[PDB]
Amino acid sequence: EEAIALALKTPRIWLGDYGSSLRDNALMLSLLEENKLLPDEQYTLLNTLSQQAFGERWLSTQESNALFLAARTIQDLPGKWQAQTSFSAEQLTGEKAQNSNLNSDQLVTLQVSNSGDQPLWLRMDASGYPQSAPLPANNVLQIERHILGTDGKSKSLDSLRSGDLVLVWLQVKASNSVPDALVVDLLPAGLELENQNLANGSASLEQSGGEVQNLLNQMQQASIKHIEFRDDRFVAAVAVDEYQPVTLVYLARAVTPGTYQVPQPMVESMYVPQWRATGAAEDLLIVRP
Amino acid sequence: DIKPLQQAGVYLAVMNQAGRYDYSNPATLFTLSDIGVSAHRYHNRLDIFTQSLENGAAQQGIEVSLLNEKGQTLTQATSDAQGHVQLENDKNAALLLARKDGQTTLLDLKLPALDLAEFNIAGAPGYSKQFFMFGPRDLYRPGETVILNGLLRDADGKALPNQPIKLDVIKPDGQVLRSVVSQPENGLYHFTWPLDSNAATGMWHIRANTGDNQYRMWDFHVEDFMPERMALNLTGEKTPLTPKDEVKFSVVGYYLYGAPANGNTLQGQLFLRPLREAVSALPGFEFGDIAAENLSRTLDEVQLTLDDKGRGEVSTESQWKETHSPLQVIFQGSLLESGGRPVTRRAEQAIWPADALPGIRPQFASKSVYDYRTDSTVKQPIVDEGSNAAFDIVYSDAQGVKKAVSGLQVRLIRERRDQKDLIENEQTLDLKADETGKVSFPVEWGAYRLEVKAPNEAVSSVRFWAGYSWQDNSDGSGAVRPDRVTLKLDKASYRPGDTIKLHIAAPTAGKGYAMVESSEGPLWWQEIDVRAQGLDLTIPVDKTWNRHDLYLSTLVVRPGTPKRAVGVLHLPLGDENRRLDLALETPAKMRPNQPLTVKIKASTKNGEKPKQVNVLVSAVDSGVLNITDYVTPDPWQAFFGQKRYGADIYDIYGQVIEGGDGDELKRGGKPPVNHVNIVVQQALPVTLNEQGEGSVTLPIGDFNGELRVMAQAWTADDFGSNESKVIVAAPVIAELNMPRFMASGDTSRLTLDITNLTDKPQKLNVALTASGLLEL
Amino acid sequence: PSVGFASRGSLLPGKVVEGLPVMALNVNNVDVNFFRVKPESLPAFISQWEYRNSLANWQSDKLLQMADLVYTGRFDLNPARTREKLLLPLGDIKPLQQAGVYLAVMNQAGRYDYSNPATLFTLSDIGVSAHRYHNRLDIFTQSLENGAAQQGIEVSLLNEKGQT
Amino acid sequence: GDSDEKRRASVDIGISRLLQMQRDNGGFALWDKNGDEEYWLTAYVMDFLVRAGEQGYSVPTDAINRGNERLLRYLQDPGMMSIPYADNLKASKFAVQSYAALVLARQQKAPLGALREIWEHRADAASGLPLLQLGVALKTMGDATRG
Ligand SMILES: [Cl-]
Numbered sequence A: 001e002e003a004i005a006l007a008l009k010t011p012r013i014w015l016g017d018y019g020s021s022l023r024d025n026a027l028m029l030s031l032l033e034e035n036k037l038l039p040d041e042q043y044t045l046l047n048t049l050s051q052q053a054f055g056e057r058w059l060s061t062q063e064s065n066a067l068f069l070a071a072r073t074i075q076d077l078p079g080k081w082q083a084q085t086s087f088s089a090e091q092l093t094g095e096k097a098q099n100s101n102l103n104s105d106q107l108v109t110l111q112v113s114n115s116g117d118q119p120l121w122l123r124m125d126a127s128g129y130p131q132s133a134p135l136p137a138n139n140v141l142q143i144e145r146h147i148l149g150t151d152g153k154s155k156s157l158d159s160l161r162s163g164d165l166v167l168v169w170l171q172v173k174a175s176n177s178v179p180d181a182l183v184v185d186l187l188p189a190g191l192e193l194e195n196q197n198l199a200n201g202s203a204s205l206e207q208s209g210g211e212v213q214n215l216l217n218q219m220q221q222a223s224i225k226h227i228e229f230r231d232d233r234f235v236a237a238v239a240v241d242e243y244q245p246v247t248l249v250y251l252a253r254a255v256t257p258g259t260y261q262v263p264q265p266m267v268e269s270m271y272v273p274q275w276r277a278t279g280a281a282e283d284l285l286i287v288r289p
Numbered sequence B: 001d002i003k004p005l006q007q008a009g010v011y012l013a014v015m016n017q018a019g020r021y022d023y024s025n026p027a028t029l030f031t032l033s034d035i036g037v038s039a040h041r042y043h044n045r046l047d048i049f050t051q052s053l054e055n056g057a058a059q060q061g062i063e064v065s066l067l068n069e070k071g072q073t074l075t076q077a078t079s080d081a082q083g084h085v086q087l088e089n090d091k092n093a094a095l096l097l098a099r100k101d102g103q104t105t106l107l108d109l110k111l112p113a114l115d116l117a118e119f120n121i122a123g124a125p126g127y128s129k130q131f132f133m134f135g136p137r138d139l140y141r142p143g144e145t146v147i148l149n150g151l152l153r154d155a156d157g158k159a160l161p162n163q164p165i166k167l168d169v170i171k172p173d174g175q176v177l178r179s180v181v182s183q184p185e186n187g188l189y190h191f192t193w194p195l196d197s198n199a200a201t202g203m204w205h206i207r208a209n210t211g212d213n214q215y216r217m218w219d220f221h222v223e224d225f226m227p228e229r230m231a232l233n234l235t236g237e238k239t240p241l242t243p244k245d246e247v248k249f250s251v252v253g254y255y256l257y258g259a260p261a262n263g264n265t266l267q268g269q270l271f272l273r274p275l276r277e278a279v280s281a282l283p284g285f286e287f288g289d290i291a292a293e294n295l296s297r298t299l300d301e302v303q304l305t306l307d308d309k310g311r312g313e314v315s316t317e318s319q320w321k322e323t324h325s326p327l328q329v330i331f332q333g334s335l336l337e338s339g340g341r342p343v344t345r346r347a348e349q350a351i352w353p354a355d356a357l358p359g360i361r362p363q364f365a366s367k368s369v370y371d372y373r374t375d376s377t378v379k380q381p382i383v384d385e386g387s388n389a390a391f392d393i394v395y396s397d398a399q400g401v402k403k404a405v406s407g408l409q410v411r412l413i414r415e416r417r418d419q420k421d422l423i424e425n426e427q428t429l430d431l432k433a434d435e436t437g438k439v440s441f442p443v444e445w446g447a448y449r450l451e452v453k454a455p456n457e458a459v460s461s462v463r464f465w466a467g468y469s470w471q472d473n474s475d476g477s478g479a480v481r482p483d484r485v486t487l488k489l490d491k492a493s494y495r496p497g498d499t500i501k502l503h504i505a506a507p508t509a510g511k512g513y514a515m516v517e518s519s520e521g522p523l524w525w526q527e528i529d530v531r532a533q534g535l536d537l538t539i540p541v542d543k544t545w546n547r548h549d550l551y552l553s554t555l556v557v558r559p560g561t562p563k564r565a566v567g568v569l570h571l572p573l574g575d576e577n578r579r580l581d582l583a584l585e586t587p588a589k590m591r592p593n594q595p596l597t598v599k600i601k602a603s604t605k606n607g608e609k610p611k612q613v614n615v616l617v618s619a620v621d622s623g624v625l626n627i628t629d630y631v632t633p634d635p636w637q638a639f640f641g642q643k644r645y646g647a648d649i650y651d652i653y654g655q656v657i658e659g660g661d662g663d664e665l666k667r668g669g670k671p672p673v674n675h676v677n678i679v680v681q682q683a684l685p686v687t688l689n690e691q692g693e694g695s696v697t698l699p700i701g702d703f704n705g706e707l708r709v710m711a712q713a714w715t716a717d718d719f720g721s722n723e724s725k726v727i728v729a730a731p732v733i734a735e736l737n738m739p740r741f742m743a744s745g746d747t748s749r750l751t752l753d754i755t756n757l758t759d760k761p762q763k764l765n766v767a768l769t770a771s772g773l774l775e776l
Numbered sequence C: 001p002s003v004g005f006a007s008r009g010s011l012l013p014g015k016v017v018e019g020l021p022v023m024a025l026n027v028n029n030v031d032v033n034f035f036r037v038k039p040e041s042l043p044a045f046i047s048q049w050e051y052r053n054s055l056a057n058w059q060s061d062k063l064l065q066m067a068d069l070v071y072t073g074r075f076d077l078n079p080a081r082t083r084e085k086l087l088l089p090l091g092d093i094k095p096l097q098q099a100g101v102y103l104a105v106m107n108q109a110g111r112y113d114y115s116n117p118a119t120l121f122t123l124s125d126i127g128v129s130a131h132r133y134h135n136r137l138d139i140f141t142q143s144l145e146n147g148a149a150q151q152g153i154e155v156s157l158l159n160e161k162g163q164t
Numbered sequence D: 001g002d003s004d005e006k007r008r009a010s011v012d013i014g015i016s017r018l019l020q021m022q023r024d025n026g027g028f029a030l031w032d033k034n035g036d037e038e039y040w041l042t043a044y045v046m047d048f049l050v051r052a053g054e055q056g057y058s059v060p061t062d063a064i065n066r067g068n069e070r071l072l073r074y075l076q077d078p079g080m081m082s083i084p085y086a087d088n089l090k091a092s093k094f095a096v097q098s099y100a101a102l103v104l105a106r107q108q109k110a111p112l113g114a115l116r117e118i119w120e121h122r123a124d125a126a127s128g129l130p131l132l133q134l135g136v137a138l139k140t141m142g143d144a145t146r147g
């Protein structure tokens, strides 16, 4: 019992054991299951495995073998589930995963109970603006922002004038595969996006970005699910990994003169919200008339 | 003298030097035959036309072996005058072969059909019952209600029984959002649904299913747009400039509420770019030196102020006076509001080094080949190493007509692999007017460039690689392009009671066929002769032809190899009496918060019987419609306008041997609300009385700008459409310019434009106060 | 579906010839090409050839650059479906009756493979037996079959460069 | 080695080849003038071409000036450098600037203001070489103390 307890606290030819963290976590899971011991530790390893498999580019034969053997018995159980919640007077039931949107009144008093004869699996994702601006932080993912002029030089963020076109350059890195990274770049109120989807009514990225052709070529190589040119933000859904950093470039215009706070660039995984990065805090943005 | 080769079947010749042993030996696939087939593919059937090479058109055709993907024959028979054949077409059909013992001709459906890019064979694919999908706009903001209307008619715009149409709302990701069963109300389909505020941005669409399981699409943008408050016109010169000429753009700006952009700033960019696709009439033909340097540049940054009339001029002196290649100057102009928000437009000015230029089109495919010098995969025209490279060369003006020239320096250049560009081969070409020059050069390996120089010093060149192809081919990039037969018609439009007189002006003499086609097959199956320089022939337009996908086609061949030429032309059957003369009477100018009255008057000459005319009136802000240069939906052009050519032509004359939802927005943070006003109105469909008169009253709110009045009219076969512009403006306009949003702790200089649109001087006091999360 | 040289020897006798031995299975027609190795720089050919069983298509360019083609002869055989070995009538080939070392490269009529069977040979009923010493070399000329034709003037002693 | 004649002929061939890899901005690409810019290798090839001139080889004046203009952009603007495969981006940027600095200083073309500003980020260095190069540059251009 001393060795087992010590094992679940010990982190991970070279070693010669053909191993990895992913493989070893799945083998440890099967060992605990097989010997019907520490069921709470089994659930912890199962969640850890789900994130590691998700973030792994390719699996070795021994990794997929171990992962298959650790998870072959979970889908053999029915999808039926029952719960009594704080936000419902009536009991919640289903045969598959059913999502339920919640507001702040519901979330602060959120309580869920298992009213079934089998275990239920819950996932709770809450989001909103903090009371104050947090400091730049990063876990798995990395993000950096830089603003260039259409001349390919770094733009002096003070000498910005109403009407100027700027190229906003984002670079996203990751220590493992993030197949579902969401890049949210909230704009300073003085910058407006040149909507590329409405080509007739805006300045062209292709035409105004000739001096950053390397960045456009890097961006063309990225696996991009979609790009959104919204009122207050630039959004990109992308896949990223350690051997392939992602370059994104968008065209913006300095519009309303004023002094603007600059939100930090953000990137996070939809499936693993703990894979998150906030870029360096920038100086105030001044748009001159 | 080879007796086994005189037998039927496809052969392969593998040659080698007597006692030589190499990795690869020259090999070719061939068939010995003087038979020349020319098939026509349709949605259900396939009509093949057997012929013969040299002097003779031996049309008899029983010998048609149509093989599938497995390699088994499906059908074989004979028909028509001198010979022809009609067969059942398959979706996964692969081959076509000719004769049992009297030689063999190979034609495969796997190869791309003849490229008719030089012919006007474009239009709607709705050959079946027509469903016209229309609305007041094609641009919506998330959280808006999408308005869509519909009218169902047959192939000839005639009414049919009340049937349900199933409509699906498709997201940019391709997933369906909602599915409905639309039922008509007084012959009109009307679909309305609200976009969520968390809706994805991009190209959404509504797909309709009439029952044919062939979806009809209605595209609409869902974007965070701002309606334009200004109109910007940037005009160059229609005719290209010479390399010595100064480039000039005339600028016109005005507020849509009816006032010039007096003193407004215009910021912009001037760019120099090559004009390789210099002739739109010749798609695929490239013009200019690809080896020429400094053709892509940023000329200047434009900064000017419009005069009191809202006028300006943009100019730049020429810095390409010695160019031998066509160029273009692009002006990307941004007309700014007093707050800074622009209205951006682009204008292009063509520059031609001469009045007529040489153009090159490779006859070989363009495949995606990786280049490690640029570390990026780029699609470039490639040909097999040790094979000849074919090219189409033309000496054309801006309009597309080929001019006569003599002394073209056709040069095959071998580009340095790892000294200087090695000139491999040289030629001298003479061109006739309306003639397409065809040059073939023996190519070795590596990078190559084919350049043609005209006596006026104008140089045009195309780069091409010689090597291997690891699949990854562009969808029919190496399709055969036939020589053009300019077909002329006597009348602009025809009808069941008329008689067509077509003039077949082929480049030379040649036997073949002349016919009228549809997507279901031909209607004038045979006509065979062509003699001298032109042929005027009679075509009686039949009364049962109730469709607008009807086209005309000709084929001619002449031996020296028998050069083949094709002619294609749309047959117009859209009658003008089926169009409703819809008149709209609206005031030119009006005040905000007052109702707008639209006076409708439907009529037609000689008839003048507008029996139960239905009118759907709508009014949309011009600043919305100008973003996507929205065209007023026309029901006449929808149901009677030129439809696409329903046939595919295959021939072997090109191969003849010669010797959750909202989850992403939740992660980013609740977006701030945008309170912009989208002025859109759609009144219910009204009925016009005995005289063909009616009135619609649309309530207009607190709007200052221009409003486009749009109307759609219908009966059973009569369709009409009209538009009028209504300026909605107050005596004194007071408009506030603000950013799209503001963040906490930001400072913004808002701008309030107070404009006196009266003939009298005004004295006003402006009292300002701030509430909510704003302070002055 | 194969055919190759069975003996893989350097010398076939002029007497009791029976050509070159070839073992075949289901192969009716065989196209054989003969090449006479250039007398000059012959030791450089032997070192490059190393008395192989087959000839590689890429390495053939360097090796057959010092050998000239004399005959392109196809041979008629009659097997339908046993892997019996058979003769090759060479007596009717007049250019092969001339002096020099030959190389036979055989292949199935319309077959294209990475390597084709090849052998280095000499048609002669002469049997020499040399004796090497610290300073001199005594050679003993003879003859195959019944007879010991000892006369020997014909002794071409070539060095590394390929000169007598 | 080579004969003196062969060796000199080969240097001349190499110069003419390297000049064809010079981009329109004066920077150098790996194979073609249209390829992406190589920041450290631009300083490397500029070092080679300037030294080649001191050793009796001809390099066109326009190419050296364009190259030097680009090296000056490296001292002034490290922020526009895209090195996405770099583990220590600041260390990479610092090695580029220090090399650029030495090549310009050996021609008396490195601005002391830029050198002093690169020197403020000395902590970014992952090797002694960029610091020794920057040091020689500062001494040559006039700041013997920081040098
Ligand atoms: Cl197990």
Ligand SMILES: [Cl-]
Residues within 6 Å of the ligand: A270, A271
């Ligand atoms: Cl998820």
Ligand SMILES: [Cl-]
Residues within 6 Å of the ligand: A162, B265, B336, B337, B338, B339, B340, B341
């Ligand atoms: Cl402004």
